[PDB]
Amino acid sequence: GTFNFMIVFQAEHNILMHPFHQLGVAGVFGGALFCAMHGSLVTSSLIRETTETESANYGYKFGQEEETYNIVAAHGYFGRLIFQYASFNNSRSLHFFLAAWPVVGVWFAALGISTMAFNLNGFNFNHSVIDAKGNVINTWADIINRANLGMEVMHERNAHNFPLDLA
Amino acid sequence: EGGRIPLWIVATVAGMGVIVIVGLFFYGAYAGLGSSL
Amino acid sequence: SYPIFTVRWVAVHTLAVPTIFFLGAIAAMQFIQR
Amino acid sequence: GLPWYRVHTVLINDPGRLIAAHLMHTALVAGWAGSMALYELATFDPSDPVLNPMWRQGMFVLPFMARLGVTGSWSGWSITGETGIDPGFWSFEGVALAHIVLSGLLFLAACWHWVYWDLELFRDPRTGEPALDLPKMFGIHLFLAGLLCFGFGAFHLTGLFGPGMWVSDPYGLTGSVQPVAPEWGPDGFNPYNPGGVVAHHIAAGIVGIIAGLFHILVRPPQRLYKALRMGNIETVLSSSIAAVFFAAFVVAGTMWYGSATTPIELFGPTRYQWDSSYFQQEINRRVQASLASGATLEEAWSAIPEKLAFYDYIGNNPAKGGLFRTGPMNKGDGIAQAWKGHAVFRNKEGEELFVRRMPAFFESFPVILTDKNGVVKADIPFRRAESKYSFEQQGVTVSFYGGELNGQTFTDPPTVKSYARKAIFGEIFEFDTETLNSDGIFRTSPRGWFTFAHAVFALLFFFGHIWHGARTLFRDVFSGIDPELSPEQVEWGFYQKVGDVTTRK
Amino acid sequence: MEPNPNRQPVELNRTSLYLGLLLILVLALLFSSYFFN
Amino acid sequence: ERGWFDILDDWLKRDRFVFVGWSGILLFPCAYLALGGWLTGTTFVTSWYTHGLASSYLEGCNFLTVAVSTPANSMGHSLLLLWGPEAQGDFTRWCQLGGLWTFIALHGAFGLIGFMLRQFEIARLVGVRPYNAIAFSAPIAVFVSVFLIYPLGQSSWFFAPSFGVAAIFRFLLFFQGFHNWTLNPFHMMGVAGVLGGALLCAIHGATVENTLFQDGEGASTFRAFNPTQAEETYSMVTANRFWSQIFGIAFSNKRWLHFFMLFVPVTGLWMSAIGVVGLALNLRSYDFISQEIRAAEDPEFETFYTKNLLLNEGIRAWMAPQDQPHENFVFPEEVLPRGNAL
Amino acid sequence: MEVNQLGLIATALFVLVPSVFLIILYVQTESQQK
Amino acid sequence: TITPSLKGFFIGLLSGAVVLGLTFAVLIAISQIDKVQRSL
Amino acid sequence: ARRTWLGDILRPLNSEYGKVAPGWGTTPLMAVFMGLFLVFLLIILEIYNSTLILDGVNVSWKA
Amino acid sequence: DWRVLVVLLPVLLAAGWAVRNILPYAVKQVQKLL
Amino acid sequence: METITYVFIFACIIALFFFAIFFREPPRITK
Amino acid sequence: TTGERPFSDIITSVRYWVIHSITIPALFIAGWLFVSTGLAYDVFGTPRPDSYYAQEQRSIPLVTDRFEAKQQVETFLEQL
Ligand code: CLA
Ligand code: CLA
Ligand code: CLA
Ligand code: CLA
Ligand code: CLA
Ligand SMILES: CCCCCCCCCCCCCCCC(=O)OC[C@H](COP(=O)(O)OC[C@@H](O)CO)OC(=O)CCCCCCCCCCCCCCC
Ligand SMILES: CCCCCCCCCCCCCCCC(=O)OC[C@H](COP(=O)(O)OC[C@@H](O)CO)OC(=O)CCCCCCCCCCCCCCC
Ligand SMILES: CC1=C(/C=C/C(C)=C/C=C/C(C)=C/C=C/C=C(C)/C=C/C=C(C)/C=C/C2=C(C)CCCC2(C)C)C(C)(C)CCC1
Ligand SMILES: CC1=C(/C=C/C(C)=C/C=C/C(C)=C/C=C/C=C(C)/C=C/C=C(C)/C=C/C2=C(C)CCCC2(C)C)C(C)(C)CCC1
Ligand SMILES: CCCCCCCS[C@@H]1O[C@H](CO)[C@@H](O)[C@H](O)[C@H]1O
Ligand SMILES: CCCCCCCS[C@@H]1O[C@H](CO)[C@@H](O)[C@H](O)[C@H]1O
Ligand SMILES: CCCCCCCS[C@@H]1O[C@H](CO)[C@@H](O)[C@H](O)[C@H]1O
Ligand SMILES: [Cl-]
Ligand SMILES: [Cl-]
Ligand SMILES: [Fe+2]
Ligand SMILES: [Mg+2]
Known part of the structure; x- marks a missing residue:
């Protein structure tokens, strides 16, 4: 039923072509990326507190006062992976970013659905490119349109009596 | 001379240049090729 | 005191030089009519 | 530890x-x-x-x-x-x-x-x-x-x-x-x-x-x-x-x-042998050579080996299965028994029509018939009220050459349509679907x-x-x-x- | 024979058991429909 | 000892603004060309001869609709090298044939290899464990399965994703209509890893920022952290209690937490890659056989599963003629599946 | 519904085999001294 | 004999050889000119 | 450790742990074989791919 | 082709002006390294 | 049998929630 | 720091803007001319608005042969 909702939504609002959903994707793709990033960087710089035969997780004790990884070493790594000023050396700023990126993106995703609720839809570039004579030169937007038309004509196949699906 | 033109002026002018060029790109969405007309 | 041409200089220009060129090209495209 | x-x-x-x-x-x-x-x-x-x-x-x-x-x-x-x-x-x-x-x-x-x-x-x-x-x-x-x-x-x-x-x-x-x-x-x-x-x-x-x-x-x-x-x-x-x-x-x-x-x-x-109609081309070559040598259409198609016809069928294409459609190919379409022969479709004017074959991408495919120049001549409509190309309107028939149905012609529109649906898969076979309780779905x-x-x-x-x-x-x-x-x-x-x-x- | 000194004790703590059972059960809840088909 | 190799090694590994390393010899040219190829194609290059599409700013497309499109289906899986037997050294024809697609895909592939080698090289030099390289295996599994394995199992590169925003959207919808890719449990695990990863990103960031110790007088709390400080900047004990009481469970081990943050989205992407490897062969989770037997026999039986297949059937019939022009599909109006009125 | 008859045994073993493996490991951990 | 695609192959082979040769020549040269300074 | 008849015979074959040739040794010759192997793989790939098309080599079931 | 010259004419005039404005500081950098 | 199977797995998951929460390894402060 | 001059120092310096008040506009104008002269079309083989179709043709010039693709496009371009 979730997938049904998504496909029909695409047919009626062209959500893929809506910048708020695109922001949403940036939020979740980026949130996953930054999750893997932060996970890998902290894990990469754990201070040796255990033997080869035991899990490194026993190197941290719940409620210990000392930090369990070396952020300066993590920064020294990531700053060299890209460049120095592209990497965080402030943990508070780093974690704020981790909070803000997916949260803001998902806010925009929520707003996409909440504003397509009132039929302000994704960008429509159907037949936007025209040649000298006036022949329509299709773009990938028009191919998206053909897919959307397939969903539109088929959905709720017995529900429509009149030519326009107005809600 | 390394420091004569203040950075805030460079940022403001550079930023304004970005707005103008992107603004031109948006204008072009409504005229000529890709305008649907 | 500071060097002028560096690896950093090359990396910056490999991006900067075509970017400005491309932007001028796309600027010109905005006046093309069918 | x-x-x-x-x-x-x-x-x-x-x-x-x-x-x-x-x-x-x-x-x-x-x-x-x-x-x-x-x-x-x-x-x-x-x-x-x-x-x-x-x-x-x-x-x-x-x-x-x-x-x-x-x-x-x-x-x-x-x-x-x-x-x-x-x-x-x-x-x-x-x-x-x-x-x-x-x-x-x-x-x-x-x-x-x-x-x-x-x-x-x-x-x-x-x-x-x-x-x-x-x-x-x-x-x-x-x-x-x-x-x-x-x-x-x-x-x-x-x-x-x-x-x-x-x-x-x-x-x-x-x-x-x-x-x-x-x-x-x-x-x-x-x-x-x-x-x-x-x-x-x-x-x-x-x-x-x-x-x-x-x-x-x-x-x-x-x-x-x-x-x-x-x-x-x-x-x-x-x-x-x-x-x-x-x-x-x-x-x-x-x-x-x-x-x-x-x-x-x-x-x-x-799959590529289907993509390039590799077996269909060889079948046609042999049929044309037989006709050129003076054989009747029945003799030409009857000279096609069962095994060659069987390769020219989408049920044997490895790109037609599913991840959880388990078992032998026989479990889907059935245990092949015999080639039915080559189906030749004609409209009332007697022009030969060719069924558009199903590409591997498609779980389902419409039935559309074209003449030798690729011009649409007949189809099976979805909406009927504005149908122009129905088998009924165009008087579509089907005749078989070679195989079990050699020499037979079918004119009953539902029968002809039934064979046209099979023709999207290529050459038509008879299957035992009962022995394995086959479900009709390609593997x-x-x-x-x-x-x-x-x-x-x-x-x-x-x-x-x-x-x-x-x-x-x-x-x-x-x-x-x-x-x-x-x-x-x-x-x-x-x-x-x-x-x-x-x-x- | 003398003992093998390479022998080592093995562990799985309670949290790991819970995490493991969750993985298994949820994987079963997901794949079961496809197994039944 | 101190020969030309060692001298070259010294220079490659200089602490400079942009680190180079041995991996940089592979990374920088391949990454630069992949990006350069994309920008070049989307600015200037058509898809008229391969797809019947306009695809560049020059032709009137915008940022969302430009693409470097795949070669025509008749190209098969040709490497389509500039000096190859298709283009025969002619740069213009090469562009018209979709040579930029294989150029970007292949340089992109060797670029990602160079980037992951860079991750290994830097980690070794700085003396950290190479978990970042390891996590990057997920983006590699995705790029390889989707941009290489998928089209290689299909008829040609044509059906690989084209490098563009709308073109990628088309790829999504194609996968829905043809592969019913949403029904695939490997895609579903991918979704869980991505959304779960984004969840973990948000929740961990927010938790740290809301369990901070007061280590300064500022109401803006960012300045009250020193990179070299020994102490944790936030309370794990307070964080743990909060979550235990709110959600029922909480992390208690910081090393486990951060490893779990690697594990979740990395594993998810890997699972989605396995699904796509299957789709390379049309080995789909398309149907539930039990559902089909019931529905065929019982015309009153309907579920959301059967509803979605009808949509797929519409997608296929309506998009195929323009999306697959090499097939020369002509579907007369009458054969098109449509519900009432629409 | 005409489901695959091996679906039940497949599901059951899929759950039981690894679940049991974890239970074996957990219990023998608990019974160790310290 | 040498088909057009075999010639194309040799051309691609030489172009890659030239690209790699020049790259390493330039990097070896720069490495020798701008040496790192170490304590004795 | 336990000696056996077979262990004694094989002893020489597991006695040189950590033994190395000095410096770069045969690395240059290794590099050449690696280079040639790369060209070999490129040739067979391009033949299979129909990017390299040779006389009398019809890459198809029909040859 | 004449447009190749017309298009690259601003580029070459810009590269030359950059060399003239950096040559005293470029010769100085190269002589310091050698 | 399928309904039973699905409901069984679900029930086992709910039981697991109960034990994971109320019969967890209690977090203990140390150094 | 890694040794290179700070970017802030550079982009606020007179000598930078003496140089780049020339190089930046020149490159921009070069790009403009690449399009305005129509050279961009011929380099990349991108149809002009009047060169997608022949006057009476309403069939897309799709490449259908792998090894005669180059000649096919040439044949298509002759037909314009
Ligand atoms: C020749 C192949 C090979 C061999 C000999 C090894 C051997 C080893 N691995 Mg590697 N590894 C491999 C390939 C291999 N691996 C592959 C293909 C992957 C990606 C899937 C990995 C990813 C990997 C990771 C992440 C880790 C290892 C680790 C280890 C070490 C401990 C393994 C252990 O105790 O597991 C114990 C396993 C179990 C008790 C149960 C595993 C159940 C599996 C997941 C499902 C059932 C599989 C089934 C029975 C077998 C199917 C056969 C299949 C090949 C078709 C050991 C040196 C560990 C290590 O480095 O320790 C320091 C470790 O963390 N491996
Ligand atoms: C290379 C491996 C391989 C391959 C390609 C085949 C191929 C085949 N087998 Mg054989 N077989 C194998 C190994 C293999 N087998 C093994 C190891 C056994 C012992 C179990 C068997 C025993 C066997 C029997 C008894 C039969 C076959 C049959 C068949 C045919 C049908 C296959 C089918 O329906 O799959 C179905 C495939 C699936 C449903 C996909 C499996 C997907 C799994 C569940 C994914 C797991 C996901 C994982 C849990 C996620 C982890 C996430 C975590 C890491 C986070 C086909 C020719 C049938 C045949 O027709 O016989 C004549 C048949 O009856 N095979
Ligand atoms: C490390 C950087 C790097 C890497 C890995 C690649 C890799 C690739 N390039 Mg890219 N390229 C690069 C840098 C790189 N390039 C640079 C700097 C430029 C600007 C000039 C280009 C411009 C470029 C173009 C225009 C094209 C490629 C293409 C390709 C592909 C085919 C290459 C090939 O077949 O050569 C084969 C050669 C080798 C593998 C080198 C062989 C070296 C061996 C070991 C020594 C033997 C040679 C010997 C000395 C010569 C004797 C020959 C004699 C008998 C005649 C491949 C993805 C093609 C592609 O993308 O098509 C879609 C393509 O058209 N490249
Ligand atoms: C993402 C890709 C990737 C990454 C990050 C690594 C990383 C690693 N590798 Mg593995 N490897 C890979 C893929 C990769 N490998 C592939 C695809 C193979 C072939 C099977 C290998 C074979 C291999 C072996 C045998 C060994 C390693 C080892 C290593 C380690 C040391 C570094 C090294 O030797 O790199 C190797 C360098 C590369 C992978 C870069 C290759 C660049 C090529 C030569 C460019 C070729 C251009 C091509 C000719 C253009 C034509 C294209 C054509 C389609 C037209 C490190 C863990 C070593 C290790 O484990 O030590 C303990 C080890 O012994 N690698
Ligand atoms: C004159 C003597 C002779 C002859 C007639 C052959 C003939 C053959 N060789 Mg053999 N060979 C020989 C001597 C010979 N060889 C010698 C002296 C050696 C050194 C020991 C070898 C080592 C060798 C290797 C390593 C291979 C062959 C292969 C082959 C077959 C090539 C056709 C093929 O199917 O390629 C198919 C294989 C390729 C086209 C190579 C693929 C290259 C890939 C693309 C490299 C990148 C890998 C990377 C992991 C891909 C990741 C990305 C991807 C997933 C998208 C054929 C049977 C190949 C084979 O076994 O085929 C079954 C093969 O791989 N030979
Ligand atoms: C402020 C405008 C809202 C934008 C969202 C960004 C901040 C709020 C979202 C955080 C939610 C995460 C959970 C709480 C995580 C949490 O607890 O945060 C904590 C973090 C630090 O708290 P402090 O107490 O130090 O500071 C906040 C106040 O006390 C003032 O000092 O707060 C901030 O950094 C606020 C920054 C506002 C500065 C303006 C940011 C504007 C962003 C621009 C977005 C543009 C979008 C572009 C898209 C194309
Ligand atoms: C989309 C990402 C999400 C981030 C959203 C947050 C918005 C805030 C903007 C932050 C963006 C990050 C940039 C930090 C920028 C920042 O805030 O710091 C400002 C920083 C100031 O540096 P300075 O003026 O001190 O000059 C640097 C010298 O002192 C060092 O010797 O300037 C830069 O680092 C920018 C350099 C441009 C880079 C040109 C080099 C290009 C080479 C290519 C790199 C290769 C990468 C390797 C992989 C192959
Ligand atoms: C292909 C090829 C090559 C190469 C090349 C290259 C390397 C290139 C390049 C290039 C480039 C390198 C380019 C560029 C560019 C660019 C651009 C075009 C840009 C832009 C932009 C923009 C427009 C911006 C915007 C924005 C953003 C993004 C964000 C936010 C805001 C804004 C809105 C500001 C060669 C010859 C080898 C050979 C063959 C082929
Ligand atoms: C589930 C599954 C899987 C897997 C699996 C496996 C892994 C299996 C296996 C298996 C096996 C692995 C088996 C086996 C076996 C065996 C056997 C059956 C045996 C035997 C034997 C015997 C009986 C012997 C005997 C004897 C002796 C002992 C002594 C001397 C003499 C004699 C000879 C008498 C996979 C992933 C694919 C996926 C899907 C599903
Ligand atoms: C350890 C019990 C194995 C005994 C089975 C050995 C069969 S032996 C086998 O028998 C076939 C049929 O009679 C003959 O065709 C063949 O010549 C012979 O080698
Ligand atoms: C760029 C490919 C790397 C292959 C490395 C092979 C090094 S080869 C090695 O080089 C030494 C100085 O570096 C010399 O002293 C020695 O004579 C030579 O055999
Ligand atoms: C463990 C059971 C051993 C049974 C051996 C039966 C030998 S039977 C023997 O097998 C040969 C195969 O090398 C054949 O050449 C020969 O025709 C056949 O008679
Ligand atoms: Cl619906
Ligand atoms: Cl209505
Ligand atoms: Fe953290
Ligand atoms: Mg415009």
């Missing part, structure tokens, strides 16, 4: 128990081979190599036995459809029995090596510590690999001392095991040339013998020994896994595209299943290589980084060279 994902690390410093674990693994694999062959023999129907070959029956190991010259059963049949043949000991059953016995012997050897793990052989004579000289071990194993590879090519494949290998005509009609001469010219590198396979094993074998001798006699450069951590058995794990995933990707590719080593009578046709062949498993495993083994490569090169920090690691090593501006203390500014 050791976390669950590390339990097998107790073997790193224990060569004897590593050999034991390897022996147990080998025993499990050979046991699987034996079991699988026996299961397949218990289920396989050998009565029809034409319309019910092994690849229609979900057979996975049977084609591998057949590929290398094992084609007969102790019960008297052979996969080519012969009766009264004596395969000797090396029938399908004999091969299965050998693997089971090998499994057992390997299991016993594992037990011995587990218990008697503390052999003087496994200890360094100078330190008394467990040690394996991996560089020399490689030379020994490479030399043996070369010998076996050469012998397989020089004796088995050539038929000089051995059965040869499966070969066939370009349309997979007359396949059999034959001796194959090596091809020494540039065509030896043609994947469809079996002589290339023979030449490969001869030549690569010799190179393996030579390089093996080199690796026994010449020690690794200090610089390579240090860089690749040749004292650490896990370096070998990393690089071996790499070689294995390369090999896994290659067998996936050759299975999917086809080669001399993935014959269509053993694994089924390829892939062993070609499809082999390709899936191997491409997936190959990809996963890439992660394995990366993981064990990391473990090898970063062993010193496996439990964590230096607690006394100086900020100067990781901050900027202290050393001219990253991580080299001698380059301090």
